[PDB]
Curated annotation (Swiss-Prot):
Note on domains (UniProt): The NET domain mediates interaction with a number of chromatin proteins involved in transcription regulation (NSD3, JMJD6, CHD4, GLTSCR1 and ATAD5).
Name of the protein this chain belongs to: Bromodomain-containing protein 4
Disease the record associates with this protein: Cornelia de Lange syndrome 6: A form of Cornelia de Lange syndrome, a clinically heterogeneous developmental disorder associated with malformations affecting multiple systems. It is characterized by facial dysmorphisms, abnormal hands and feet, growth delay, cognitive retardation, hirsutism, gastroesophageal dysfunction and cardiac, ophthalmologic and genitourinary anomalies. CDLS6 inheritance is autosomal dominant. A chromosomal aberration involving BRD4 is found in a rare, aggressive, and lethal carcinoma arising in midline organs of young people. Translocation t(15;19)(q14;p13) with NUTM1 which produces a BRD4-NUTM1 fusion protein.
Transmembrane feature ranges: none
Localization terms from the record: Nucleus; Chromosome
Gene that specifies this protein: BRD4
Coiled coil: none
Quaternary organization: Interacts with p53/TP53; the interaction is direct. Interacts (via CTD region) with CDK9 and CCNT1, acting as an associated component of P-TEFb complex. Interacts with RELA (when acetylated at 'Lys-310'). Interacts (via NET domain) with NSD3, CHD4, BICRA and ATAD5. The interaction with BICRA bridges BRD4 to the GBAF complex. Interacts (via NET domain) with JMJD6 (via JmjC and N-terminal domains); the interaction is stronger in presence of ssRNA and recruits JMJD6 on distal enhancers. Interacts with NSD3. Interacts with NIPBL. (Microbial infection) Interacts with bovine papillomavirus type 1 regulatory protein E2. This interactions may serve for the tethering of viral genomes to host mitotic chromosomes allowing successful partitioning of the viral genome during cell division.
Site feature: Acetylated histone binding: 85
Tissue-specificity statement: Ubiquitously expressed.
Modifications after synthesis and translation: Phosphorylation by CK2 disrupt the intramolecular binding between the bromo domain 2 and the NPS region and promotes binding between the NPS and the BID regions, leading to activate the protein and promote binding to acetylated histones. In absence of phosphorylation, BRD4 does not localize to p53/TP53 target gene promoters, phosphorylation promoting recruitment to p53/TP53 target promoters.
Highest taxon listed in the record's lineage: Eukaryota
Family as reported in the entry's similarity comment: Belongs to the BET family.
Result after altering residue 82 to C: In CDLS6; likely pathogenic; reduced acetylated histone binding
Amino acid sequence: GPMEQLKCCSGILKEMFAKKHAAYAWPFYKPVDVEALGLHDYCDIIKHPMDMSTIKSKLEAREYRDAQEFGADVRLMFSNCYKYNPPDHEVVAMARKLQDVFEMRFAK
């Protein structure tokens, strides 16, 4: 049931945090720091920031009622990256790789 689906979601996120994917997942681990150099315009562009640690905290607080809700936040995280950065940016390529990891798990 929903309990089982959410346990699967936790396992997917755990894999996304794993050393195996760390070379391309690390930009997504923590909230974007809008005080860091270069990011002063982030909140002009991104209305709903999202990151893996926030998703983890929401799973722990049981905020997601089902897998679709969890997946929406994962996709929001990637979409923010695709919206904020130029398409040839290195972080966009890293997002695409981590999104592939996610989508193949989430589908199955």
